[model samples]
Target: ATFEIVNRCSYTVWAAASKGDAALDAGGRQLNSGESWTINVEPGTNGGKIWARTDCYFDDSGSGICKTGDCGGLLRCKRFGRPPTTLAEFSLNQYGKDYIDISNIKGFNVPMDFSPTTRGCRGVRCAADIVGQCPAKLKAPGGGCNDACTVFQTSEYCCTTGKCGPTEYSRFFKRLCPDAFSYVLDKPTTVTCPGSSNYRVTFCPTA
Candidate 1:
């Protein structure tokens, strides 16, 4: 899949994917306002997800830390971004074949727009100001709001029981972003597009 990632935010965003962590050119795409990067989700990749890292400072070796969505302090992440970061997860030629999801289970640092560029498949609108309306319990230190599971980590929040339904915390986010996977077992939030479709993911997309 060809993934076009654009940073429309006023600040800088270092975009990353899971498997390409060892290589900066393959994994990390640093973008300033209105900048864009194209990435190919090569085959045989596993657990692939995309996200943005903020407030980063790196040396010549591309080694440093991102305040949010950090990974081993490497400009290219060695793994998926940490909690308190939103994930644009795609199941491309892997598990959940052809499935696409925008998970807000961790947190929402920057609003993102994700959709198939060549198809009519529905896109995700994660444009809510969740950070501003965050409940104190789920609020992270920075300008982002953590999901209940990311904060509490209890079965009540994480949910393995089949009966797990939406919680008050999940509802808070669901009301804001109906298109996002707000909590575990959110079958109501499922979505998918064509297998060979190209995608556009824009961070801090214009309202």
Candidate 2:
């Protein structure tokens, strides 16, 4: 019914989440701490995605670089943000239910609380201090943590055929964020809710 982005982090976050409309992309403006915005979206039959960015500096023209989650350096993201992004990926009306999940396969930048506002479906979060504890080799350029796949282009971490298992690096994220996707072939963690349910995504969650 509706999708809301709530920023509870200490710093400003330039968030990106929108539909096919380019105008909507232009709305990915700077959201300071304690501000929240809603994008009135009627769930599509397919999946949708959202990510938060930090350490950014954008001019009035809406073009600049961010330390993390820089999607083309545009204040308005025209594409998916880069890695070390805590992703809130979702879908609706899939086989008569709504599906939701959190992913850190790209990496983790912020602590997030993803939950259904309607129905009794429980929430899922990936709120770990990954940036501080990230492996030295897997550390990202920005103040975030990255997965091993991007660090090493091997089939084991990449898992092109879904034939790979969890690695020590993956387990590190899993231990901190067991509910989120640590690897490509990790077990099913999708949360299903009634189609009538709404959703909320909270960054730097206190909960």
Candidate 3:
């Protein structure tokens, strides 16, 4: 399988993807405006996410911090990004179908879309202006909105236990990005496509 990362923003974005402790191709590369990078997804690669890091300042050794989506202050992330970052999540060839979604359960810092390269599959996205209209309480220190789970860390927001459901806070994100995952129980956000289909993950699709 293959995954393509495309940048449509005016500025540069550091694109990263990881599966377990392994960094995928273009894991720590900067994608300039209109540029794209493609990486092959090896068989058995599962439980991975792709994301963009913005406002990063790296030294020659690539050791620095990103204003948003920094991963252990490293150029190559061996793990997941911090909150307030837009994410495209996937679990390929599992349980007879491929699962994927654009998730804001950690809150959104950028606009993103996860689309299938093949026909007959509908794409999912969260391309709204989440940062500009973020709720004051859920706002991130750098920018964008913070997931209620990250803010409250309670069972009600994190859904860590019990029969959890969406709250008014989650509804705010759901209202803006109906097709994206706004909270942990937002199962409807996931889309099942053929495991054979390749995917295109676009950041700042409107730019």
Candidate 4:
């Protein structure tokens, strides 16, 4: 099968290997200016999923959150903040392709960087023991959760109150990315006014 972009913008298109830890960047190809190209692929061998990424970022300030109005409905609406998902091959049955639908992807493994120095209602937002508190390794300038845990917190980490504990955030990662590279520094607390934000890996099936 082949894939093409709708040309929302004059941006570069990229694709990666459907499976494996090898950096998918080198294997990807690019689309030319207003040009359509096709390449033969062995979905069965690579699990058939394609990793396509846009080089540009959609103007989030212009649009709103990337999501379908219906939580459990069919596709219909603007494609905002949507990340590339695994288009598993059902016929191949490599990983039990029963067929599944995922949406509202902010991109597979977005490097979300929060400000540890940012002051919140509570103390520091990104503490080492805090849940969802990304180690310095994972957080990026653009900011989003992806595979690869943080190495260690530094003086400039985002230490806020949104730690990754027992909440929608943690449960979301656990349910969506069970087999993927994930870690949590959640803590049991009775306080409820404000929560901690821990670092997390969301997109890749594995590290």
Best by TM-score: 3
Give the Å shift of residue 76 in candidate 2: 2.0
In candidate 1, stretches whose alpha carbon ends up further than 4 angstroms from where it belongs are: 19-25, 43-46, 94-97, 160-163
Error of 1 at 110 (Å): 0.8
**Candidate 1 structure quality by residue, lDDT tens digits, 70-182:** 87787877677766777787766553346677888887778888888877478876888887898899888855788897788788788856567889998888888888888
Cα distance off (Å), candidate 4, residue 35:
4.8
Each model's backbone clash number: 0, 0, 0, 36
Residue-level lDDT tens digits of model 2 in 136-169: 9989876799888878988999898779999999
Q: Write the per-residue lDDT of candidate 3 for residues 1-207, one digit (tens) a residue.
A: 888889998889888788758787646678898998888876556887898888988889888888878887778777777888888988888866688888888888889988999865788888998888888999998877889989988988988886789888899999888998888887677888877678999988884
Candidate 4 error regions (>4 Å): 3-10, 21-26, 32-35, 53-139, 142-167, 170-207
Candidate no. 1 TM-score: 0.89
lDDT of each: 0.78, 0.82, 0.84, 0.27
Q: Compared to the true structure, candidate 3 yields what TM-score?
A: 0.94
- TM-score for each candidate, following the candidate numbering: 0.89, 0.92, 0.94, 0.31
Clashing pairs in 3: none
User: Model 4: per-residue lDDT, tens digit, 29-95?
Assistant: 3443344333333333332233334343224332222221111111211121223221111112235
C-alpha displacement of 2 in model 4, angstroms? 3.9
